[PDB]
Each structure stands twice: as structure tokens, then as C-alpha cells.
Amino acid sequence: QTSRVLLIIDDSPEDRELYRRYLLRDRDHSYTVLEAGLGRRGLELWQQHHPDAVLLDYRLPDLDGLEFLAKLQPQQPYLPVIMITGQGNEAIAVQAMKAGAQDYLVKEQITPEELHLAVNGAIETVHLRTQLHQRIERERVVSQITQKIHQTLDLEEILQTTVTEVRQFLQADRVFVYRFQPDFSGIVVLESVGDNCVPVIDAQVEDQYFVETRGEDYRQGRIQAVADIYTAGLTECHVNLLAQFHIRANLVVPILHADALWGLLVVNQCSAPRQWQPLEIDLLKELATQLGIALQQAELYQQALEH
């Protein structure tokens, strides 16, 4: 049973209660239910809570359902709205679906099972469209970096292009590349930042975990994906440390050269926690692998000079 936020927008307190009772009868999910009796507040709750689905009464005191959809501006998001219409007004349902709704229900004909089916579909379909959009953007990033590696030997340009595009794609506060010194200490080679996190470049913090251990887990590929340093169960030493650079969410991907650990591709969220998705993690492993190709390429260019 996963969690779902469902927003009900209907001016009849009883219908809201009816729908609320119906959604609880769903074994597949646990629903957090938000309510509004007016369109304007519906819009406000929508904008503040990003609910997974919206049950929308076509006839509200302030807005008709069509006006509500038109007052919605949504990356490139899709609206998980189910229009609720009265029997006989199906023509509204059709023009609502052409305006962005995912499905509709007939008020007096609604059953719990039908409600589940509607919510499932609106959510699944928006998820498909969201995933497809993410696949397209993720492909642009990978191809753009592939392009760079084919067009140049220089690291400063490839790493830079990498750091920027991932920050753009992920909408992260910070992305940078951390490089290990021979004495297993670290420095930030490149960076790209949003002004919500206290900088790290030029202000170097000395950790003792990489000098002492050398990162054998990172050599053999270990990645860390911390959604929120306060709920992941880290030690008090680590939590307090990250709080001083305002890192709230942490994603770290090792960069490998030869059979050795060259450095780290690092993503930060500094304002709020962030649950890193499988697609995003997979993107970074891939880029890191391309960086390995770049580094290797640059070293073969160094070796070829000396000859």
C-alpha cells in the first residue's frame, strides 16, 4: 500500500464525504484527502500540495469545470483531473477531456469501484506522460555529452557541460565534480549552483573518511542516495556536518579511471528533502561512465604526447 494525495473539489459537503468513504474502501492505497468547497481554494490547494489526483465538480459556485481547467497553468506536466458531471451533461465531459482532464464520472452513477478505476487511470496515464517526457530530456543530456566527447579531448569543457546539463535536467540546487588528490584528500574541480546553498568551492572542508578508507566501496561502484539527512539514519557526526553546508538531500556517484577511483559527481538539494528516482540514478551512472571514457581519452592523449 503506497501513499496518495487526493484533492476533492466539490461544494456539497455530503458528496465530499461520500467520495471520502469510497476511497478508504480501496485496499491498494492509503489516501490523504484534501478538500475544498470552492474553485479558488481548489486551485490554491492544488498549487501548494501537488496532489496525485483531483476529483473536480463541474459546477462550483465560483467556477464551472471548464473555467477551472483554463485557470490551470502547470517541466511539462499533465493534469490528473477527473471531472464529475451530472447525468445528461456528457457534452461537458467530452469538451473537458479535450481541455486536459483524464477521465470523468457521472455524479449519481458513481460506485467505489468506479472511483478507484478512475483515479488509478488518471494517475497511471499522467505518470506515463511524465515518464515519457523525462526519458526524452534524459536522452538529450546523454547525447549532448556524447557529442562533446566525440568533439574534444579537453576535460574542462566536458565536465562543465556535464555539471550544467544534469543540474538543468534534475532542477537541483547544486551539482559539482569532486576530485581526489593523491593523498586521498578532495577538491571541487567544477560546479554549477542555484543560490540556496552555502558554497563549497574555494572553501575546502577536510573529511577523514576518504583518506582513511580510500573509498574501496566507491572503487567497486557504491552509490549513495540520501533523500533527507534527518530521516536516513546517519550518524550525528555526518548529519551535523552536512547541515553546515545546508545539504538537505545528497546524491553521490563515483567516477572511475583505470581500476582506480578518480573522483565524484555530486548532486545537492539544500532547501528541502528530495527522493532520488531510479531513472535519475541511472542517468548519473551512465554519465559517470562517459566521464570515464573522457578521462581515459585525455590520458591516452597525454601518454601519446610523451610517446
304 binds, among ligand CYC, a second copy, Mg ion, none (CB under 5 to 8 A by kind): a second copy
Distance of closest approach, residue 195 Cβ to ligand CYC, in angstroms = 16
> Do the strands 103-106 and 81-85 form a parallel or antiparallel pair, or are they unpaired?
parallel
Between 113 and 154, CB nearer to a second copy: 113
Report how far residue 94's alpha carbon sits from residue 21's, in angstroms, rounded to the nearest whole number: 27
Distance of closest approach, residue 47 Cβ to Mg ion, in angstroms = 21
In the sheet that holds 260-269, the strands lie side by side as: 186-193, 174-180, 260-269, 249-257, 224-226
272 binds, among a second copy, Mg ion, ligand CYC, none (CB under 5 to 8 A by kind): none
Give the per-residue contact string, 5-34, with Mg ion (x = CB under 5 A; - = no).
------xx----------------------
Strand partners, 29: 2
Between 154 and 282, CB nearer to a second copy: 282
104 binds, among Mg ion, ligand CYC, a second copy, none (CB under 5 to 8 A by kind): a second copy
Look up cell 499522467; give the residue: 126
Q: Does 228 bind Mg ion (CB under 5 A)?
A: no
Breaks in the chain (C–N > 2.5 Å) following residue: 74
Distance of closest approach, residue 125 Cβ to a second copy, in angstroms = 6
Give the per-residue contact string, 109-128, with Mg ion (x = CB under 5 A; - = no).
------------x-------
Report how far residue 25's alpha carbon sits from residue 298's, in angstroms, rounded to the nearest whole number: 61
Q: Which of 59, 129, 214, 246 binds Mg ion (CB under 5 A)?
A: 59
Per-residue b/e over 203-213, b at no fewer than 16 CB within 10 Å?
eeeeeeebeee
Q: Which of 264, 267, 288, 295 binds ligand CYC (CB under 6 A)?
A: 264
Give the distance from CA 37 to its chain's centroid: 31
Between 140 and 285, CB nearer to ligand CYC: 285
In the sheet that holds 81-85, the strands lie side by side as: 29-36, 2-9, 53-57, 81-85, 103-106
Which is nearest to 224 in space by CA: 206, 246, 242? 242
Q: What is the DSSP letter of 3?
A: E
Between 146 and 275, CB nearer to a second copy: 146
Q: Does 188 bind ligand CYC (CB under 6 A)?
A: yes
Site residues for ligand CYC per CB under 6 A: 178, 186, 188, 200, 204-210, 214-215, 224, 237-238, 241-242, 245, 250, 252, 264, 266
Task: Return residues touching Mg ion (CB under 5 A).
Answer: 11-12, 57, 59, 121
